[PDB]
Design a protein around this ligand. Structure first.
Ligand code: HEM
Ligand code: HEM
Ligand code: HEM
Ligand code: HEM
Lengths: 146, 141, 141, 146
């Protein structure tokens, strides 16, 4: 990986406390609110007009859960992120046409959400370990683009 | 901020481009698609084969827009208003991609204006493209 | 562009920061140094260890400038003029780094303002920091 | 870096036509003119007051020579850029304190210089290959930062 033992323990520990369903929904909703251009991928999700609409949308909540669950799987294979995300990398490129820059934005919003959710437990060193992961995942997903 | 000298530089270089603006616009796009393949994610509906009418047509529209901006270099916000609306509300291109096309336009100009691409003109064009990019991205949020 | 709702959000959130602005400035720098080690290249002369008074002192200055910016949200360029001069002509920090500190400031705020850090406020703060960043880098070239 | 053989050859071929000293001075001077903040490392070089002064500064030219000479040697090791640039990576971080963003800027200026120098011979595919090389070198030089 990119991560250190101190950093893997850091990552793994915090992740045990995350409610994937809840965090996923928050992370995707915030992406759509903070960087509205990202809404171009979700025209069929319904009302995305205001922050409250975005945040309460069931389809956003559903999708967020899907994304973070896949994200969680990668946490189990921190040593082979590329192998792990190969199929999804190809899917996002070939069928979905998602600019990989979106993976980077989501990673940053996720960090924001963890800090918001965990407060003082989300210390500078823990953040640093999560920044490495998020960058790693984004790189893994962009890997099969062509 | 474009200085007076910058505006002079841009008008000089762009002038030289003249009637080739559209062909140069097409070449810059092809350079971008090849160098930065993630940019293709915004053109899944296009035939991106070398010399396709779609790319040539698009390159022309891009070049026309740039000419418009040079012409109204003192009032870009107003001159590119409609285009800034289109990009912000419809196209929704991540802002990172503007820097990639800008670089490819710079390379295109460099390859075609041996005499005019001095360090000073290079600097002015870079600033000019950054300015256009800023205006086109202005209404995103 | 900062909308009236954006200005209100920023003034409310920053209001709550209140006397802690200095502490949060230091924490954001700490987060920055650990998360994005390339940023350390600008402070070879500092003791960057956890608890360093140099970082604490610098944190306070950054925070005070932000407070100044909040107070002068409608007249940022003038309020931040000396700072724009300093970064452009002396410090010469690559513009890319401003986005890294901004993200770290956001994380720091999130970690300290559970209640206030709503999606709407998060969006306003991000726009505000981008605005400050733009101003600070305005005179680079 | 991800260069097919076609690409390595397109790189090697054009490079054989380069005057390293000349291109080196041009690229460094243009970096200093186009992105003036990069001048921060060179105050001991004297006069950098104008484009003309930069372009004509003997120290700028000598430094460009040195930088492009190392670049040039790296082209012989396209397959092991990281190993080839490891010590230089460490020096740039530990002793010179150079933000790796500067390597990316230089890489882009280098491409503009080659385009200016080679005109029509610098085709879209040739650019694409050089883009990969310049990204590769930048990454190799930033690799040991900590
Ligand atoms: C953390 C990074 C991400 C992961 C792990 C991830 C994972 C997934 C998964 C597991 C699916 C469902 C695949 C299936 O239908 O079998 C999916 C679909 C999708 N993802 Fe991603 N995703 C990520 C980020 C993003 C981002 C940032 C965007 C755009 C902003 C995006 C856009 C989409 C879209 C549009 C779909 C299709 C949903 C539908 O069928 O309506 N994803 N993603
Ligand atoms: C200097 C920067 C740019 C300028 C001046 C520019 C200008 C234009 C113009 C004039 C149009 C046509 C509008 C019409 O048909 O009414 C357009 C459309 C479009 N642009 Fe932008 N553009 C720029 C950057 C970009 C970038 C960086 C991308 C993506 C990487 C992009 C993606 C698009 C797309 C997808 C369309 C729609 C094409 C179609 O469906 O025909 N543009 N742009
Ligand atoms: C929100 C963005 C920023 C603000 C408001 C800000 C503000 C300030 C202030 C108020 C000072 C002290 C000026 C004085 O001594 O009179 C300063 C100095 C400095 N800043 Fe910036 N800054 C910002 C971003 C950055 C970034 C991103 C970096 C690099 C990663 C940076 C690097 C420095 C350095 C190296 C100094 C001089 C420190 C010393 O020697 O004590 N700044 N900044
Ligand atoms: C392709 C990218 C680069 C390569 C291959 C490279 C290579 C080198 C080499 C071979 C040296 C001499 C090391 C020694 O003293 O043994 C050096 C020194 C140095 N480089 Fe880099 N360099 C690159 C980019 C840059 C950039 C972009 C900057 C700043 C804008 C920079 C700043 C410096 C400085 C300040 C020195 C010390 C000069 C001296 O002591 O005379 N380099 N570099």
């Amino acid at each position: 990986a990119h991560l250190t033992p101190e950093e893997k323990s850091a990552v793994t520990a915090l992740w045990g406390k995350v409610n994937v369903d809840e965090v996923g929904g928050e992370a995707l909703g915030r992406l759509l609110v903070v960087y509205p251009w990202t809404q171009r991928f979700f025209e069929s999700f319904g009302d995305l007009s205001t922050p409250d609409a975005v945040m309460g949308n069931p389809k956003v909540k559903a999708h967020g859960k899907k994304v973070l669950g896949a994200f969680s799987d990668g946490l189990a294979h921190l040593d082979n992120l590329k192998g792990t995300f190969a199929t999804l990398s190809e899917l996002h490129c070939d069928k979905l046409h998602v600019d990989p820059e979106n993976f980077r934005l989501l990673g940053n919003v996720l960090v924001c959400v963890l800090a918001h959710h965990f407060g003082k437990e989300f210390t500078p060193p823990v953040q640093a370990a999560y920044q490495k992961v998020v960058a790693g995942v984004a790189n893994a997903l962009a890997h099969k683009y062509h | 901020v474009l200085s007076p000298a910058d505006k002079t530089n841009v008008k000089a270089a762009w002038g030289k481009v003249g009637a080739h603006a559209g062909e140069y616009g097409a070449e810059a796009l092809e350079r971008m698609f090849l160098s930065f393949p993630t940019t293709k994610t915004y053109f899944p509906h296009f035939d991106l084969s070398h010399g396709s009418a779609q790319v040539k047509g698009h390159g022309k529209k891009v070049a026309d827009a740039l000419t418009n901006a040079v012409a109204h270099v003192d009032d870009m916000p107003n001159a590119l208003s409609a285009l800034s609306d289109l990009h912000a509300h419809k196209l929704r291109v991540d802002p990172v991609n503007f820097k990639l096309l800008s670089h490819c336009l710079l390379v295109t100009l460099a390859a075609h204006l041996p005499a005019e691409f001095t360090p000073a003109v290079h600097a002015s064009l870079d600033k000019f493209l950054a300015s256009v990019s800023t205006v086109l991205t202005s209404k995103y949020r």
